[PDB]
Design a protein around this ligand. Structure first.
Ligand code: GTP
Ligand code: GTP
Ligand code: GDP
Ligand code: GDP
Ligand code: MG
Ligand code: MG
Lengths: 49, 426, 428, 426, 428
């Protein structure tokens, strides 16, 4: 019997595989204050002599 | 110190009752070789109810195994917790009585009831009051419904005031194996309505439905369908074995659920029942346990109580509880759902708090409900019976073993009567 | 003790029994000497210290088949006196095998019925294996089923007959032998499974894709069927279907006991791993109309009581879901007087393989002994076979010359004619 | 106390509510596990408004996630803060309602929605009162608007006094995919006006305008957009959740914004918002907060309020602050800006003060505003609708399953008279 | 649960399907034997031992092109009788694949289509490949689509036509077979996608710098398009467009359902690394009136719907801004009953490259499938092909020879003339 012997909570508990891999999600440029994050910047200007 | 003689009959009854003897052995500390293991006095004082006392020292169960095929009892004996059973209470038979109620009731099983009833006597007059005969058997086979009907009849004529419970499983409409199942039920209900006090009606589709939509078991089996029945039977006889705030034994269950004696086909249930993620995610309040009793999903009948009227309903609560929320959860379900409850009974309800919960859980409920909605069970068995009997399909192996066709017409007349008095009572 | 006696009469009876006893010896572990290195009790005894003698009466009217078994690799496995051999054949003549030559060989064979029954306690039935399409199997098949019905006429009789084939046929007097066998197959027979010839031929076309297989490969497929018939007897099971439950859930009236077989999957080494063969898919191929071992289309007929014999790693829920999907299919038409009709049994033992056979390692297999009204047209073609030959008394001068009175042709014809009338009124 | 039942519909609703349960859990100190991780009674005392309690802690959200395609709810489950939901608080669904209002509202949604109101009902009368329902969904999509707006009518007819507060993403016409956006949006607004209490129009396009111009996000993903809306979603339910000097529930918002029975399409803006490196330069006083929330760039709906008036506005402040600095700012915007404020109503603004700021920010503002400029997209989606509907656009996939052509003209007619009702007060 | 059956019919159907299943097995990891060392159930099932069999049913009346597949490296991949074969071909004759000998392959192909659909919980599309302008991809393709509609109601049946090139054909009966095919790909097909061989020839020359491509390189470009079409159906994405979405955002009327496709990071390995293949760059090349995989310039028509399938590391703001850019472009003309016509889809998994193929590794992708009032010139071009031939009864005596009614040519001509009138009136 797959059921618990007194609790009736099955113990095998399974592990059905995720259909898609379910990745690439989120994580947001904003960081818990609605601001931005400190990613590396660029200059996109002239050569600064 | 009241006793229960537990007789399991049929292949289905032997398997259901074997699951009963392991869910009551761990509930009482009994090892497979009968020895108490812990140190709790509350787990041992009412061992006389379902167990005997040996001069060896072991608490053998008060069980009588009963099946004309000597293959299922070999499985029970060789399985775990099968070494508890006394070998004298293994009345064999070697013919089979295969899926024939005529063979179970009039042919071969007739010269076996005179030996199983000796075993019943050796267990029954060993005390000064017996409480009941808890009998588990099938209604779709030959050994189960047939010789089961023999044993319920001769036990009642010997013992007129003793209770006898019947956790019988009825034939299943959607998919069922035995072709002569409507014959095996119509001829069995006729004696199950006049020699029985309580018949807890159990099917197979709703037990599959429970382990599909409360447990989400992708892999059920016949063992875990029986472990639900054994858990329900444990909670019904819980006040006979354990102390409680409001004790209520089996006779208290009978006197407060039947209006009139023929209307005694109840519906059983058990309602803590969690899923895989939903073990950590489920509260353990009394109102939620009340919610899972009164769902068609967690009914062991597939005979939906919404399509009908609750004549009387009782719930054998178990666990460390508050004695007030055990009652206004019954009051609120009777008021927010008042059209689903019979008007000529105010207080259609019983609550009974035992104080010993099942192991691991904090509380438990076992719902026993007399409903109008057992109409649906008898009317579709009548539909399957009439369709074959009108052209006499498979009849000549019931007449051949010795009957006559009036026994079939009276068996349907009793069970077409059984849908009738439930109908003006609605 | 659970046991059953297997009769084998005729060339087809012995040769099907060769594949049956080969497969039963493999499953129980019993070697070709009998010495294996309580499941055996149904088919083998416990002679000596380890000599498991098989439980059969090999009977044929020729020397040729029986003595070659007595000179084969299974010589000192059978009890050699169980192999009763005749001395001259019935010569495709029902009169010879029932009146003149068979009036002596039955007396010795029934003497081994007495010893094989007194050796055993709790006998259940008689798995008789006979052809019907000639002498011997029809002649001794009639006479054995007559006298076994008067001295053992309280027990089951599982007769796996080989009915004549519709189009192909290796005898011209073959219509006469099987019209003159329904006089015994109708009443001195408890279950009469009808097996054919093209029906195993074209199972071998589409499924095993063997272009040129032999009668041995037919007999192996029949042997796998028989091991699934008596599967719950020897071995364990969730739902056990013993010999009295193949007949209390399948025979609705005492005359209608002509059922048809359907094994699945008869699958080779190629396609076994290319499919996910499971409880739902196997019974869908079992209800495929060409998967009958009868050449009998169940579509222009209609079912009355079907029996399924799931075997292997089969969970009872999956029987239930597959039976439901079969029931919801529209081309499969059951009867009004049977809202039920799926007697399902499950064996825990997986089906075996014969090494160097034609079948692959398959976990699950379903046998299907089904009763329908389509069996009526199998007898209806043979009724048409009878009356062209009997229009001007063809081949009668041997039947009447050997002892029969000429009226037995018309008596067996009207008895067979009342059988299709019974199969037509059963489904109004 | 007070209780909110959060139902998320469709791919948009499930992904915008999953971020909402990430930002509420951060505010209440709850892990992805579901245990508290702080020492603050204020952070835990008003937790029943969004979380239930199950035995050993495990604060489960009152979330009724529901969809007809099993692609986006599993992405919630596999992500962080996604195991908080119960496995049975996930009303699944196979096949799918592929961009059809009818495949969510007449067929393919009617079968599933019976199970949806079951999960709603257990999480509705599982407490003592109920403030209302928070419903995040999508008008520009089939399974989002179809059973989304159907559920709006079902829980209104079951509880016709609870606040039906709905966050919906309206299809802005300019830069957005899927061609049936006019047919889904126009048909769904018709059901949304007599069945919802506070429809908050939150467009994807104007959220992009917030990201590009205010935040200056180089690559604003869809998690960035949902982070903004979840912040406004936390700021409106603040006073049910945290103490304050002047408190304001959701029923406060409906009374003090809605002058006439329909009139319930508001515009939200949340603003401690700052550029990339501008956290070292911005002030966080009330005058800069007020000057920012009234900026048309700080609308979540691109329905520019300078092209209209303010019928009635509201600003629920948060953080530690003084009452007159609220009041003189709420009065100075009325005195200085007088043209874009309606005259037949005096004092066209309420204010509230939560004393609990959002996590990290010292002060914050949400600005829910009933403006008579929402008719700009009530014309925009109507012109898109009638350009298609005149010469018989995509309709055979809206007719063959049950709608007739008259429901489309009546949906456009209710759109048109609500345009005329907003143009009445202009 | 999501699942698509592919049905490759004809020589061109099989040969395109070889490229498709080669790419699919290299993309999900399945080796040519079936094993990989649950994002696969749209195109593969699971036997149980790590074994994966493709979900395809190959059809041909010759045995030549399909015996190639069962003797090459992908023979243990497919189930051995998925590859359904006949004996003799229709010989470029529509009536020879419909009214004669391809009527005995149809009952065995629909046998296995049912076995490949009942073992899948939820079917979302019958992907179908044909070679319209031939004998088996036209005649048997027509009867198969009629049979799939009556048996499988709704259940949207996709199609990838191989419609003959306007100015080169490699037949002369190819006007006849394509016009006779419009009685199947107009009222039985929903997703009739129009591919001409000449247009993908020009794609290979102008983009890949292959002046001499073979049919295998033709099929490799098509297979990448179908993989990107089913990309959301197998892999996760920010905006998933399944089959049900496709027949709501790209088909305004049930008769106007004809689409043109254009993949366009189709860049050679030498020229891939000299431009960034950014989102705007690959969709500007997608809307060029030369990368369209039918010979049909969209500038002389009017777009009514466009379904773009951006695949890879494509940020949704770059999808949105590029759609804004092409909306600003005046060279394309969207019809007045279409304010928005730009159903977009995003899948994170980048397109794969076959090792030794003719493409290059690319981070992004666009698959642009659109309906327009420019496809009317495609059907009106073979209108001139038909009436030049049928003016004095060319090659019709060998269509009516095997049973085609003399006159079936005529209502095939008013079926093409009906859709000619429909395309002009949905652009006014
Ligand atoms: N299934 C099966 N049928 C067989 C086999 N051998 C013969 N038959 C059938 O049996 C019929 C003829 O009867 P047989 O069993 O061969 O021989 P018989 O019954 O002993 O009759 P006699 O030859 O007169 O002794 C033929 O029509 C065959 O179809 C076999 O090996 N397998
Ligand atoms: N896309 C593609 N088209 C092909 C291929 N091979 C042939 N064709 C085209 O198919 C058209 C003719 O069809 P066939 O190749 O003969 O196939 P069919 O239509 O099924 O006709 P059958 O010969 O009866 O099989 C020609 O005009 C070719 O352009 C191929 O490998 N790929
Ligand atoms: N729940 C349960 N049902 C069973 C079991 N074994 C058999 N059954 C039921 O019993 C029916 C078969 O008849 P059976 O009880 O074996 O006839 P019997 O031999 O007379 O008892 C089937 O429909 C099963 O549903 C079991 O172990 N558990
Ligand atoms: N705010 C937000 N909008 C989204 C999200 N996903 C899609 N959308 C928008 O919703 C529209 C498509 O809605 P859709 O997902 O098809 O709705 P549904 O499939 O019916 O549930 C697109 O125009 C997107 O701009 C999301 O996660 N968040
Ligand atoms: Mg012979
Ligand atoms: Mg060809």
């Amino acid at each position: 019997t797959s059921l618990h012997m007194s609790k009736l909570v099955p113990v095998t508990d399974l592990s059905p595989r995720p259909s898609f891999r379910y990745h690439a999600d989120t994580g947001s440029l904003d960081a818990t204050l609605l601001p931005v994050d400190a990613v590396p910047q660029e200059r996109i200007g002239r050569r600064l002599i | 110190m009241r006793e229960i003689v537990h007789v399991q009959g049929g292949q289905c009854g032997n398997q259901i009752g074997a699951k009963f003897w392991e869910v009551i052995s761990d509930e009482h500390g009994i090892d497979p070789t009968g020895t108490y293991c812990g140190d709790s006095d509350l787990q041992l004082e009412r061992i006389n109810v379902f167990y005997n006392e040996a001069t060896g020292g072991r608490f053998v169960p008060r069980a009588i195994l009963m099946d004309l095929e000597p293959g299922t009892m070999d499985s029970v004996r060789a399985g775990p917790f099968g070494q508890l059973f006394r070998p004298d209470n293994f009345v064999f038979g070697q013919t089979g009585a295969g899926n024939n109620w005529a063979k179970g009731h009039y042919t071969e099983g007739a010269e076996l009831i005179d030996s199983v009833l000796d075993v019943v006597r050796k267990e029954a007059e060993g005390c000064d009051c017996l409480q009941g005969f808890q009998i588990t058997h099938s209604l779709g086979g030959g050994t189960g419904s047939g010789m089961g009907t023999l044993l319920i009849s001769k036990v009642r004529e010997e013992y007129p005031d003793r209770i006898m419970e019947t956790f019988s499983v009825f034939p299943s409409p959607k998919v069922s194996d035995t072709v002569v199942e409507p014959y095996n039920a119509t001829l069995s209900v006729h004696q199950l309505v006049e020699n029985a006090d309580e018949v807890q009606v159990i099917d197979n589709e709703a037990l599959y439905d429970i382990c599909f939509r409360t447990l989400k078991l992708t892999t059920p089996t016949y063992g875990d369908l029986n472990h639900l029945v054994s858990a329900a039977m444990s909670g019904v006889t819980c006040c006979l074995r354990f102390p409680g705030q409001l004790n209520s034994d089996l006779r208290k269950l009978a006197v407060n659920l039947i209006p009139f004696p023929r209307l005694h086909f109840f519906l059983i249930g058990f309602a803590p029942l969690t899923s895989r993620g939903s073990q950590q995610y489920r509260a353990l309040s009394v109102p939620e346990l009340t919610q899972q009793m009164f769902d068609a999903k967690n009914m062991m009948c597939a005979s939906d109580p919404r399509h009908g009227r609750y004549l009387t309903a009782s719930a054998m609560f178990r666990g460390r509880m508050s004695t007030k929320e055990v009652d206004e959860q019954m009051l609120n379900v009777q008021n927010k759902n008042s059209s689903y409850f019979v008007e000529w009974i105010p207080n259609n309800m019983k609550s009974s708090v035992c104080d010993i919960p099942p192991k691991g859980l904090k509380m438990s409920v076992t719902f026993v409900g007399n409903s109008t909605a057992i109409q649906e069970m008898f009317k579709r068995v009548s539909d399957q019976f009439t369709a074959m009997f009108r052209r006499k399909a498979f009849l000549h192996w019931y007449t051949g073993e010795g009957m006559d066709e009036m026994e079939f017409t009276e068996a349907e007349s009793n069970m077409n009567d059984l849908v009738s008095e439930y109908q003006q009572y609605q | 003790m659970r046991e059953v006696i297997s009769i084998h009469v005729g060339q087809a009876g012995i040769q099907i029994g060769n594949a049956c006893w080969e497969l039963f010896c493999l499953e129980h572990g019993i070697q070709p000497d009998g010495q294996m290195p309580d499941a055996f009790n149904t088919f083998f005894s416990e002679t000596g210290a380890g000599k498991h003698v098989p439980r059969c009466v090999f009977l044929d009217l020729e020397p040729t088949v029986v003595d070659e078994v007595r000179t084969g690799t299974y010589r000192h496995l059978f009890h050699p006196e169980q192999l009763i051999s005749g001395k001259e054949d019935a010569a495709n003549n029902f009169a010879r095998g029932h009146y003149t030559i068979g009036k002596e060989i039955v007396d010795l064979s029934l003497d081994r019925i007495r010893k094989l029954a007194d050796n055993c306690t709790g006998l259940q039935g008689f798995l008789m294996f006979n052809a019907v399409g000639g002498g011997t199997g029809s002649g001794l098949g009639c006479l054995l089923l007559e006298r076994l019905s008067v001295d053992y006429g309280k027990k089951s009789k599982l007769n796996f007959c080989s009915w004549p084939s519709p189009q192909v046929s290796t005898a011209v007097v073959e219509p006469y032998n099987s019209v003159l066998s329904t006089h015994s197959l109708l009443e001195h027979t408890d279950v009469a499974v009808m097996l054919d010839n093209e029906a195993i031929y074209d199972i071998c076309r589409r499924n095993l894709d063997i272009e040129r297989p032999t009668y041995t490969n037919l007999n192996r497929l029949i042997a796998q069927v028989i091991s699934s018939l008596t599967a719950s007897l020897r071995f364990d099971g969730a739902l056990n279907v013993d010999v009295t439950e193949f007949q209390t859930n399948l025979v609705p009236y005492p005359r209608i006991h002509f059922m048809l077989s359907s094994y699945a999957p008869i699958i080779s080494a190629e396609k076994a791993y290319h499919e996910q063969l499971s409880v739902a898919e196997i019974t869908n191929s079992a209800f495929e109309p060409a998967s009958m071992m009868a050449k009998c289309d169940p579509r222009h007929g209609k079912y009355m009581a079907c029996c399924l014999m799931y075997r292997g790693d089969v969970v009872p829920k999956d029987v239930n879901a597959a039976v439901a999907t079969i029931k919801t299919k529209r081309t499969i038409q059951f009867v009004d007087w049977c809202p039920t009709g799926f007697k399902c049994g499950i064996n825990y033992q997986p089906p075996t393989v014969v090494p160097g056979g034609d079948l692959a390692k398959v976990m699950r297999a379903v046998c299907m002994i089904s009763n329908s009204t389509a069996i009526a047209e199998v007898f209806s073609r043979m009724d048409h076979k009878f009356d062209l030959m009997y229009a001007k008394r063809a081949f009668v001068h041997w039947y009447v010359g050997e002892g029969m009175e000429e009226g037995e042709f018309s008596e067996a014809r009207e008895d067979l004619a009342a059988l299709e009338k019974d199969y037509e009124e059963v489904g109004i």
